[PDB]
Amino acid sequence: ALSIDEAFRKFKSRLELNEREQKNASQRQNEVRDYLQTKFGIARSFLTGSYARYTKTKPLKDIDIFFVLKDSEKHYHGKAASVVLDDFHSALVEKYGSAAVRKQARSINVDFGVHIDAEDNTDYRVVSVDAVPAFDTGDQYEIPDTASGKWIKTDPEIHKDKATAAHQAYANEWKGLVRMVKYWNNNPKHGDLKPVKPSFLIEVMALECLYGGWGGSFDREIQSFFATLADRVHDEWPDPAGLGPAISNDMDAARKQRAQQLLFQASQDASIAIDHARRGRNIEALRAWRALFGPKFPLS
Template structure:
């Protein structure tokens, strides 16, 4: 019979991207970048989002592709509104990939490739001419451009993972699987940002699985703090939970509270040596990627 620690190790492995998925994602990223260069001349690209931070889980779906433009390459050089810029990106993608219908989103344009099921959220960004490394990205709902820096997001995630002795990223992936099974009541990036802070107060008991305790701790931390304002990690854009409705946050809090209770029960079963009972509870929370026995 697997101990809880052994089951979690196997579960974490099951969430990792396979080598073929990773190769295909990078191949398609190069294709999209080259296609955009032929039309709108982006200067460079950054694989951002969960894929760029190495917190994506399998099966891989949408990858954030951050395309950096100079102001002169934004089309004709004139001031361009956020929605108009996104429409240019959409048109360029559809011209380069005939038969594909790109979808306009709030800050990006999504295009999906058949066969692999991998899609890209293409985020166009204009570099601030006075502050290199600071970028302006479109926000259709606001009708304006907002600041961002995905490299700072990667740095914040890596720093928190280092503080947690490289255990945070696997825990974030496990939280994402739980969130996915719940119908994604908590926005994915909000969950990550809360985890960066929550892991700092984690003090594991050496007698129990560290990953199990980490999950229980983060469930409890998030359920108690989800209603707060969570600053964007680069300190540039609006709060991460900006635009998330109160109803959605309350639903997320309710689901996290329920997970906190179940995780506490699982820890107690592990504490008294009932590995089968503890693993059964974790499998209920984390789905069939968590080993049955």
Template sequence: MAWTVYGAFCQFRDEVVDLPPELTEKARLSLYSITTRVAELAEQKSDFPRLGAEPLVYGSFARKTQCQPLDDLDLLVVLEPGSARPTSIRRDRFGFDLEASRGPLARFTGAFLDDVNSRSVLDAIRNEIKGLRDLEVESVDRRLQAVRLKLDFYDWNFDLVPAVPVVKDGMTQHYLIPNGNGDWWRTDPRADADRLTAALNRHGKAFLSLVRLVKYWNATQKPRLGSYHLETLVANVMQDKGKMYTLDLPELLARCFGRLTDAVFQPCPDPKGLGPDLDLGVDWLRRTQISENASWAAYFTEIALEYDKDGETEDAFGAWRDVFGKAFPSYGSE
């Protein structure tokens, strides 16, 4: 039973927010299965883009910032670049053309241009991926940047994102992924992994718990921020001379919500320095509504801290339920 705020947060995280260990292991096995089957498909189907390396797991699951429910897993399907060469384009300051007059990507160019069309690559993956057994065919769809599929024995989707490595002096500098318009944007999940490692070295594991709690809160709100955008904002605002000032989650939440109130109005550049700003497309009305939601969350967290400090634990539980909803344990609940 939860009789203390500390105990309530432990119960809340274990039962509601964090992915259970057995689910995490099942998800990892499913990624291995998909990776193996995609590799087999690429070998068997000549129309499937030629693979250049093992797929890379990325996204919230890879960064260990995924909260429940687990709804999708992201894979970069690394393609063989051959002699393909990226060039920047004027119409999109973050966009790139990918020129390939020959090599494995040349068949995805237009009739009169040597530019690889990322939509054509997505279509080729989409058309061939339907050959996977146990696949819910209707769930396969070409999206802006990925081919989404669902196997009938998993509860989550798989987003397959074609990625072309940009190599210099034998080293992969970054990857090009579809931008939704037929061109390409840069990304590099390795940079995200390095950034997370640095955050953990600075702040400890409390940082991951904080991110997952704020993501869970965000998922209960309307409107909501994109997952990666929010994660980046949390990392940006929760630094005090390089470190979080406390490891106490309730206090961290109060500080985080208070700072997010203003942070959502600020530009949020891609922390990798490769792609467009993460707040691209978030209009002023939506920012205002999200800021108001964060302001209310900050208000109730402060009230909860005061109640707990004064020994009014049951009232503190009620204030935390105002933040996270009825999924947060009630006082004395099992």
């Protein structure tokens, strides 16, 4: 039978990136870049966001791709945010169609319509990308923002550095704990609205909410991680880069209240699974973890 430690190691492995997935992200990048280069002056592109930090969970959705505009395109930098986004959205619709392409605040999501099965498998294919028009202003980048109407500054290296520092300070178990909790955050059992919004806020909070070091047991770590997240999701969570507004500003007070309850319920469910394990009821423990996380958590 599966021990609890073995089930979590297997769950962790399932949330790690394999070669075929990485190849598919590169290929999707080259596809969208080659198409957008025919319609915009685009100097280069790179994968960024949680995907590049290895804190993105499965299935791989909303992979951020910065599309660095050439000097010929500098007129967009003076125009409002919606101008560049609308033009990107319009070019992308022409190729991928209306249903697959959605304007967002700082990007255009392109959905490749891959089949996602009940256990979140996609035959190692990425589900979608976030296409982000960007100017390289020297040490950082500026990207459109429709909440502001204007261009905002962002520095992906800072988030990358803080993630690796947290990881190294948690015996290289930090990023995996983040991916597991994000997997729970994406469970369709919560409905159409995630408990925590945006997903990046889980990572931002984990920079402080995972502290001390790795205890060595996934089940107790997950339980305490949920309990701490519940206690602190009402705190202010500024941008760790110090370049934009706090990451905790997207949820209103009612949404934050649901977040705390769902995080608290996750801690209770996790406590129930721990009690089962402690009392020798191992199948029952696995089943409780499966109900918490979803089908990717193994029963065998």
